[PDB]
């Protein structure tokens, strides 16, 4: 159960992992002349951006409740990817994602990781409300789930993780392409996806065409004084493309 | 556990020298809790079902830890078992918790009729039942605990008829906008 | 489209065994039923065709409720309605489509007009409907010139006529309807389907001129998706709806009583 | 031609193809 | 399907003779009519086709009586009905099927809706029906969301419309409907067909909104079994019915006055 | 008019009988792969249970009114057959049945024997009542018909034999596979049947998939001091099969 | 070192075991027409009894001394197997046996398991004595070995495990088909055997045609508070057959 | 083809075969 990974300039491994299911079996690819909408020959940064980038350390505990991100927004700051995104009205990209989560032989607990589509998050508050841009687009900073006092609550998404933050049951979440970090089974987990939309390419900053969720399905523990472990995620964009070049987006 | 992840999970007690029952469930696809699974809901959208069901189970405890466990099925017309040996007379699997993560096994289709009704009223399909085949053994100063997660899906055998507007969900009044 | 037969399975044991797996892979678990039962061969021969999408989506259901009162005091003004087209405010149909990222279909549309008398008779009555695609001039008045319809799909019903229907082809500017969306119209409000799902509106209006009978007209409007296609399944709605376009579910002065029901102990079925 | 699952001939007649709204598998 | 012709039969006697038998065998008795009549040849040529099952079962008859009053005071609550589907409460149809162990058929279903006026007019009226298979959410109210029907077979009628009908295929989880059953649901109550024959229910409900006309709606519902098959004949019902699923016949404060009629002496015809 | 019979280990004869009609001409057989519902290779006890077993002596008189049984329940105690039945949720079996009823050349009277299907018995009492399990399932003890005082009458079946206990006329009962014990015609009678149900196999203890009736159509008499004769019935199950093994049923 | 096992309806695995030696290499089989004594076509319950059944939990400690069983008596209560045994004067069957004995990576100790033939146990007491039926036939309840006060001692077998309870040296016991539970080597152990006797089939309840022994050759220990582990054994009969059907044996 | 008892051609047209509800002998 060993893998190595190589994209654009950068490489990844686990020597205790079971291979990704490729999302729907479709290995990532560029747009087709048969399906395209945009007229130009689009921007292929290739190796300089279909390469890995990784998020700030989250860390977790038995008390922890969940984390997620929305893409491409979660990668808006990833140099070439980030600006090439911000300077175009449109683009498209798939992703290779690996989540890094080693423990000792002496830990238990499990996370589910789900790649998830439009994942249209429900409000925290009841009634005539909807989610505000700052929170739907948390950037690489992401949304960890917490017990208390998130301001502007009327525009906040719900914290209700076991309702998938949208009023659907968890545990059926395995309907999406998914994996488990299980500390016995593996030390890491991986998933890869092509581009997807109802449209052949999309307004990157305006719509998170993919999203990624990680949930503490089983509580972290060990008897060791190292009561907590970080998690980090690395992503490479795939076949990344951009079209309608103009100024940098604000 | 309901308002949380924990209703998907069960906790095991490495402290116990016993053969005894860990849990049990019905097998009728639109019974609680199974109805709440996506196969459950799809069955709940339907009136007839047929074919055998896949069930799967991960030893979510500490990697250093060992056990073997009994997962068993009860052909109905009879009460849900009350000894491990009762379940051993039923169709069952004993889980060699090797390096590999998961045991997976099937309730065989043993309906008299080629189909069964998806929701029982005053009716039954049989039971899932789970038991300590050995005691669970952690090595010393491991957490005095373990977790198990349980999965189901339709086998290649599985099918439905009489699509019906599902039991599972209710609308009261107007849906506001 | 059918299941295979199931073979006889010999009673055996071996070093080879597939009953074990890593569900953590994401792949579905050890697939085969013959592995752990010494089966007889059976002609398992039950068709999955009712389970087809052109079946499950492809049964009609109600969509919306065009209730109106015939106002007298300005008959010419008030006696029309308009409704924003969505699949998001009748739960059963909603839950068919709230099962995917995207779906595409042609639409049987069916009208069940009903007249309710508040008076000793109804007489002859005739009723207009119009599909108002966005940027058609919306009728403001039961006498509005917008009831003229040189190119808008407008259709008529009257007392004693059979139920109207039409086939509406798949509409979207995109390949498929968004069942969900993860962002905004470009200046950042209306998060989700309220961005993407601007189909415009259906409309209705009494066509008979001013007359003495106080009446309510109610149209139940129905649709079936056929020639269907669907895109990446997603988990079913667990709880009551709330807010059409929005996935909101935490209702006011209420709690999250899902379809799951509790029991006293997990060792009791 | 005749219906593949069946024992009879029937085929479209309404004008524009999308308007049929009834598909094979 | 026809009888044979009958041959001429020669007047004879012989040591061979088939007129004697052992009815105690269970087999039907000495079969042949030409044995004891010196017949002329006749083209006995009368078809048995009216006597076919696709004839005798295959004529429609009424099944049940959906009588309703339109309540005013809570029009929105009360004005619907539900009926447990059975062939066991109209005698003629019942006796067709109370003739076998089991039967299988597809069903013409036909609706004869009738409106009776308790008021000076009825106006336009529209009416819903739904097949409620078991574990569909049963409508509780004339305003229940359960009137939405994304996949349930629901159908509409209104004043001046022709009689509705549909073809319902053979339903059972088993090969054929139990006409009778000899035991229970597994915990031992509801002895007989009340176990096996859970088809769920038909339902009906006024679709027009609240209106001034006090009315009764009555639907006579009819069915014919066609594409029929039947299984092991059993003797006809001798006496009045009593209890739908149950074969009960000893009625309260009554006596067993069967179809047999007595005569003064057995030597008088 | 002579026969010998041999099933599983045990043998039967009459030298004054006319052969059974086979029920509907279908000689008994196992399930087919073409028709089956149950998934396992099922339990074939073969010789050890497709063999004869016989009921306690009933005896009859001019005053006697009738007897019947419901199957498989009437055989629940027949060793291998009985337990193999009780330990499975499902099974199926046909039957060979012979009824033993010799008299002298100097007796008259006649019984009809009818094999009968689900034979859904009517209540004794009127109104909102149905038959209780203890009586539908009398075991090998069976139901003789009597004039008086059967307790729990509300849950008792009717005693009305000439109404076939279900409100159908006797004498038309010959619609089923049947024979007569007629003391002149024979000294015994026989019938054999395959399995039958609307289902390819059935919940044995929960549903009497077959039933057997014997009725004094003509009163027993002789001038001899032996004013009464026993009857007994022997049965072998046929092609008997069982599926869904678990604990013994209560 | 992984196996899966499937008999009659039920399945077993270990993912830390070394395969059984098949006893004498003879894979189990039915009797032959060339060798048989009994005249009937015998009872083949097949799947409904050549399936697994398992014994009550024993548990062991550093202080523990041994356990054994005698077959078929140890399985007299195993539904179909048990009654089919008790209702026949004769039968025959081989067995597949697996013993379940997982510990942590942090335990030591070892058991020898020996399948053993007629294993004719010696008395506890000296002199003109022999073993009483209650003890030779302990049923599924088996014989654990204990330090004290077993009543009726004159009819008890000896407790002397290292003398194999018959006055033969242990450690030579590997003459039989055998395995070790060694907690480093494996987490379970397995053995399978055909039928055997000087006779082609045998009086099941009257003679334990096979026997099974498990002995604490090396003491159980771990430093963990879980000072003891259960053992359990599961067995499927093989090619099981029965002949001379009559009443249930007492 | 034509009706075997008869002198004319007529055949099914409604969609799903069970729904016909009219059988030969």
Cα A119 from Cα A210, distance rounded (Å): 8
What are phi and psi for residue C102, nearest 5 degrees?
-140, 155
- List subunits contacting chain G, requiring 3 or more Cβ pairs under 8 Å: B, C, F
Cα A72 from Cα A84, distance rounded (Å): 11
Ranges of beta strands (E only) in chain E are 61-69, 80-84, 100-117, 126-132, 154-158, 165-168, 177-178, 201-206, 215-233
Instruction: Pick the residue of A1, A218, A224 with the most B CBs within 10 A to test the interface with B by mutation.
Output: A218
- Measured CB to CB, residues of chain C less than 8 Å from chain G are 11-20, 35-38
Cα C97 from Cα C101, distance rounded (Å): 9
Rounded alpha-carbon distances, angstroms, from residue G35 to A18, B91, F143 = 54, 34, 48
Rounded alpha-carbon distances, angstroms, from residue E132 to B81, E73, E135, E152 = 35, 27, 8, 7
Pair G196, G134: CB distance under 8 Å: no
Collapsing DSSP states into helix, strand and coil, what is residue G226?
A: coil
Query: What is the residue-wise DSSP string for E78-97?
Result: H-EEEEE--S-SSHHHHHHH
**Buried/exposed A125-150: b ≥16 CB within 10 Å, e otherwise:** ebeebbbbbebbbbebebbbbeeeee
* Contacts with E255 (C-beta within 8 Å, 6 or more apart), sequence order: none
Pair C21, B56: CB distance under 8 Å: yes
CB contacts, 8 Å: C216 with chain E: 209-211
- List subunits contacting chain A, requiring 3 or more Cβ pairs under 8 Å: B, C
Token look-up 């000793």 returns C120
Beta bridge partners of A144: A67
G6 touching B (Cβ < 8 Å): no
CB nearest to G4's CB, from C11, C14, C37: C14
Domain definitions of chain B by residue range? 1-177
Q: What resolution does the deposited structure have, in angstroms?
A: 4.7
What are phi and psi for residue C214, nearest 5 degrees?
-60, 120
Distance of CA E81 to the CA centre of its chain: 21
Instruction: Pick the residue of G187, G220, G223, G233 with the most B CBs within 10 A to test the interface with B by mutation.
Output: G187
Collapsing DSSP states into helix, strand and coil, what is residue G48?
A: helix
Distance of CA A39 to the CA centre of its chain: 29
Cα G57 from Cα G59, distance rounded (Å): 6
| Widest distance between CA atoms in chain E | 88
Distance of CA A109 to the CA centre of its chain: 21
Q: Closest Cα to residue C62, out of C95, C90, C96, C104?
A: C90
Token look-up 């308790």 returns E118
Cα E83 from Cα E109, distance rounded (Å): 15
* Contacts with E162 (C-beta within 8 Å, 6 or more apart), sequence order: none
Pair G70, G119: CB distance under 8 Å: yes
Helices (H) and strands (E) in chain B, counts: 2, 11
Cα B119 from Cα B164, distance rounded (Å): 12
First to last CA, chain C: 36
**Structure-token pair, residue A236:** 């490479």
Q: ∠ CA(F56), CA(F62), CA(F64), 5° rounding?
A: 45
D8 touching H (Cβ < 8 Å): yes
The radius of gyration of chain D from alpha carbons, rounded to an integer in Å, stands at 10
**Structure-token pair, residue E79:** 């004005």
The verdict on a CB contact (< 8 Å) between C231 and A21 is no
The strand pair at G10-14 and B91-96 is best described as: parallel
- Measured CB to CB, residues of chain B less than 8 Å from chain F are 52, 74-79, 81, 86, 89-91, 108-114, 126, 157
A160 touching C (Cβ < 8 Å): yes
CB nearest to C190's CB, from A70, A118, A130: A130
**Structure-token pair, residue A44:** 């292929």
Whether the bond into G72 is cis, omega within 30 of 0: yes
Pair C108, C114: CB distance under 8 Å: no
The verdict on a CB contact (< 8 Å) between G59 and B140 is no
Cα C5 from Cα F33, distance rounded (Å): 10
Q: Closest Cα to residue A233, out of A115, A62, A120, A92?
A: A115
CA F39 to chain C, closest CA, distance in angstroms equals: 5
How determined?
Answer: cryo-EM
CB contacts, 8 Å: E147 with chain C: 62
Residue of F nearest to G85 (CA): F80
* Contacts with E262 (C-beta within 8 Å, 6 or more apart), sequence order: none
F199 touching B (Cβ < 8 Å): yes
Token look-up 């006796």 returns E95
Pair G5, C13: CB distance under 8 Å: yes
The verdict on a CB contact (< 8 Å) between G83 and F83 is yes
For F89, other C-beta atoms within 10 Å of its C-beta total: 30
Cα F172 from Cα C30, distance rounded (Å): 57
How many CA atoms lie less than 13 Å away from E20 in the CB half-sphere?
4
Physical contact, G and E (3 or more Cβ pairs within 8 A): no
- List subunits contacting chain B, requiring 3 or more Cβ pairs under 8 Å: A, C, E, F, G
Q: Closest Cα to residue C142, out of C78, C82, C202, C204?
A: C78
Instruction: Pick the residue of B104, B128, B160 with the most C CBs within 10 A to test the interface with C by mutation.
Output: B104
Instruction: Pick the residue of B32, B95, B141, B143 with the most A CBs within 10 A to test the interface with A by mutation.
Output: B143
The verdict on a CB contact (< 8 Å) between A127 and C252 is yes
- Measured CB to CB, residues of chain B less than 8 Å from chain A are 3-5, 8-9, 36-38, 41, 58-65, 101, 141-143, 145-147, 149, 151
* Contacts with F172 (C-beta within 8 Å, 6 or more apart), sequence order: E235, E236
Token look-up 């077979």 returns E153
Collapsing DSSP states into helix, strand and coil, what is residue G174?
A: helix
Cα F8 from Cα G245, distance rounded (Å): 10
What are phi and psi for residue B41, nearest 5 degrees?
-65, -45
D20 touching C (Cβ < 8 Å): yes
Collapsing DSSP states into helix, strand and coil, what is residue C24?
A: helix
Pair C66, C81: CB distance under 8 Å: yes
Cα G17 from Cα G145, distance rounded (Å): 26
CA F83 to chain C, closest CA, distance in angstroms equals: 22
Q: Could you give the angle at which helices F80-87 and G80-87 cross, rounded to 10 degrees?
A: 180
- List subunits contacting chain E, requiring 3 or more Cβ pairs under 8 Å: B, C, F, H
Cα G174 from Cα G177, distance rounded (Å): 7
The radius of gyration of chain F from alpha carbons, rounded to an integer in Å, stands at 18
For A16, other C-beta atoms within 10 Å of its C-beta total: 15
**Structure-token pair, residue E185:** 């649901």
F89 touching B (Cβ < 8 Å): yes
* Contacts with E51 (C-beta within 8 Å, 6 or more apart), sequence order: none
The verdict on a CB contact (< 8 Å) between G14 and B68 is yes
CA G169 to chain C, closest CA, distance in angstroms equals: 34
User: Which stretches within A92-219 are classed as H helix?
Assistant: 133-136
Distance of CA G94 to the CA centre of its chain: 11
Cα A68 from Cα A116, distance rounded (Å): 10
- List subunits contacting chain C, requiring 3 or more Cβ pairs under 8 Å: A, B, D, E, F, G
CB nearest to B50's CB, from C28, C46, C242: C46
Q: Closest Cα to residue B156, out of E123, E70, C2, A247?
A: C2
**Structure-token pair, residue F21:** 């009609």
Instruction: Pick the residue of F54, F78, F79, F244 with the most G CBs within 10 A to test the interface with G by mutation.
Output: F79
CB contacts, 8 Å: H21 with chain E: 106-108, 167, 224, 226-227
**Structure-token pair, residue B136:** 């669970």
Pair A52, A234: CB distance under 8 Å: yes
Pair G116, G213: CB distance under 8 Å: yes
Task: Write down the CATH number for the domain with range B1-177.
Answer: 2.60.120.20
Which helix (H) or strand (E) covers residue A46, if one does?
none
D11 touching C (Cβ < 8 Å): no
For E25, other C-beta atoms within 10 Å of its C-beta total: 21
CB contacts, 8 Å: A221 with chain B: 143, 145
For A47, other C-beta atoms within 10 Å of its C-beta total: 12
**Structure-token pair, residue A123:** 């409000």
Pair C227, C169: CB distance under 8 Å: no
Cα B124 from Cα B117, distance rounded (Å): 10
Instruction: Pick the residue of E172, E224, E227, E230 with the most H CBs within 10 A to test the interface with H by mutation.
Output: E227
């Amino acid at each position: 159960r060993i893998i190595q990974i190589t994209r654009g300039d950068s490489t990844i491994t686990s020597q205790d992992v079971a291979n990704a299911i490729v999302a729907y079996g479709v290995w990532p690819h560029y747009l087709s002349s048969k399906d395209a909408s945009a007229i130009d020959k689009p921007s292929q940064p290739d190796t300089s951006s279909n390469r890995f980038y990784t998020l700030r350390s989250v860390t977790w505990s038995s008390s922890s409740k969940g984390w997620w991100w929305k893409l491409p927004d979660a990668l808006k700051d990833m140099g070439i990817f980030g600006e090439n995104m911000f300077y175009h009205y449109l683009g498209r990209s798939g992703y290779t994602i690996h989540v890094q989560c080693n423990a000792s032989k002496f830990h238990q607990g499990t996370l589910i990781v789900a790649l998830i589509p439009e994942h249209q998050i429900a409000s925290a508050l009841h009634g005539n409300v909807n989610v505000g841009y700052n929170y739907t687009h948390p950037g690489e900073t992401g949304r960890e789930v917490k017990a208390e006092t998130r301001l502007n609550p009327d525009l906040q998404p719900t914290e209700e993780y076991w309702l998938n933050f949208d009023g659907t049951l968890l545990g059926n979440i395995t309907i999406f392409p998914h994996q488990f970090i299980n500390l016995r089974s593996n030390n890491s987990a991986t998933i890869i996806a092509p581009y997807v939309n109802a449209v052949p390419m999309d307004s990157m900053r305006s719509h998170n065409n993919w999203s990624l969720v990680i949930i503490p399905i089983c509580p972290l523990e060990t008897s060791s004084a190292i009561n907590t472990i970080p998690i980090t995620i690395s992503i490479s964009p795939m076949c990344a493309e951009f079209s309608g070049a103009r100024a940098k987006r604000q | 556990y309901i308002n949380s992840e924990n209703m998907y999970s069960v906790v095991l007690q490495s402290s116990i020298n016993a053969p005894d029952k860990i849990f049990s469930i019905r097998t009728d696809v639109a019974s609680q809790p199974l109805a709440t699974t996506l196969i459950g809901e799809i069955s709940s959208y339907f009136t007839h079902w047929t074919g055998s069901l896949r069930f799967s189970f991960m030893f979510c405890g500490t990697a250093n830890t060992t056990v073997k466990l009994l997962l068993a099925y009860t052909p109905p017309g009879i009460a849900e078992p009350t000894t491990r040996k009762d379940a051993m007379l039923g169709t069952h699997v004993i889980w060699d918790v090797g390096l590999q993560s998961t045991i997976s096994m099937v309730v065989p289709w043993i309906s008299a009729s080629h189909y069964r009704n998806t929701s029982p009223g005053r009716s039954t399909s049989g039971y899932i039942t789970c038991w300590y085949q050995t005691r669970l053994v952690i090595p010393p100063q491991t957490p005095p605990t373990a977790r198990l997660l349980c999965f189901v899906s339709g086998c290649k055998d599985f099918c439905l008829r009489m699509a019906r507007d599902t039991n599972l969900h209710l609308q009261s009044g107007a849906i506001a906008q | 489209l059918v299941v295979p037969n199931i073979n006889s399975s010999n009673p055996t044991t071996s070093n080879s065994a597939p009953a074990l797996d890593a569900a953590e892979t994401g792949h579905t678990s050890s697939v085969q039923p013959e592995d752990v039962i010494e089966t007889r061969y059976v002609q398992t021969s039950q068709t999955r065709d009712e389970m087809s999408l052109e079946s499950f989506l492809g049964r009609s259901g109600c969509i919306h409720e065009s209730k109106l009162e015939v106002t007298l005091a300005n008959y010419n003004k008030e006696n029309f309605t308009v409704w924003a087209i969505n699949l998001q405010e009748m739960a059963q149909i909603r839950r068919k489509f709230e099962l995917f990222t995207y779906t595409r279909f042609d639409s049987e549309i069916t009208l069940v007009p009903c007249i309710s008398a508040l008076s000793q008779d109804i007489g002859h009555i005739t009723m207009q409907y119009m599909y108002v695609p966005p940027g058609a001039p919306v009728p403001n008045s039961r006498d509005d010139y917008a009831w003229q319809s040189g190119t808008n799909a407008s259709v008529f019903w009257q007392h004693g006529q059979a139920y109207p229907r039409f086939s509406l082809p798949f509409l979207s500017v995109a390949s498929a309807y968004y069942m969900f969306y993860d962002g905004y119209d470009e200046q950042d409000q209306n998060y989700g389907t309220a961005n993407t799902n601007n189909m415009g509106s259906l409309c209705s209006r009494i066509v008979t001129e001013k007359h003495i009978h106080k009446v309510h007209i109610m149209t139940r409007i129905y649709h079936k998706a056929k020639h269907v296609k669907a895109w990446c399944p997603r988990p079913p709605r667990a709880l009551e709806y709330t807010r059409a376009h929005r996935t909101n579910f935490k209702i006011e002065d209420r709690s999250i009583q899902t379809a799951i029901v509790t029991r006293p102990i997990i060792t009791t079925a | 031609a005749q219906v593949s699952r069946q024992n009879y001939f029937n085929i479209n007649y309404f004008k524009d193809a999308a308007s049929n709204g009834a598909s094979k598998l």
